Symmetry: C2
């Protein structure tokens, strides 16, 4: 049956995604009981982005210290393993 | 009085640091009421490293999901600003 290891986690897909990769990311997050937000807020816990570190990311953190910025490969890898993998292995950082 | 914005936070300095950087990192963590762990454990919350991502980091995460891996510049920057800055601004991730 369908796994739900994303349960209780709020996602926000940020920026541009090629093709319909946004559609497939929405599907995997939804399938595993994650919750997608239409707008960025303090209720967001994971920002999924294919773009590199944005000056706005630091602004979002000043109100949401627990916020995590992760690559789309985290969602895929969680699907490959059918298991919640650490977001730290796919994080986005200012370099 | 001494500031204590590192209070309740457990650090672990991983790997080699050049010269005496390890001692000054220990100094700033200790001065601001942080606590160093001599070895990795469930108690560790922040792994400070200047080197590449280690294969052991992943195994530490499977028992400790909240683990954060940060660069030494985070310790300096919090000293420069005299305030706890977000670790995400100096985070470390696997490469290549």
């Amino acid at each position: 049956e369908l796994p739900d290891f994303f349960q209780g986690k709020h996602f926000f897909l940020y920026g541009e995604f090629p093709g319909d990769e946004r559609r497939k990311l929405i599907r995997y997050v939804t399938a595993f009981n994650g919750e997608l937000e239409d707008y960025m807020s303090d209720r967001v816990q994971f920002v999924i982005t294919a773009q590199e570190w944005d000056p706005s990311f630091e602004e979002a953190l000043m109100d949401n210290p627990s916020l995590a910025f992760v690559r789309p490969r985290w969602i895929y890898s969680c699907n490959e393993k059918q298991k919640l993998l650490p977001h730290q292995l796919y994080g986005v950082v200012p370099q």
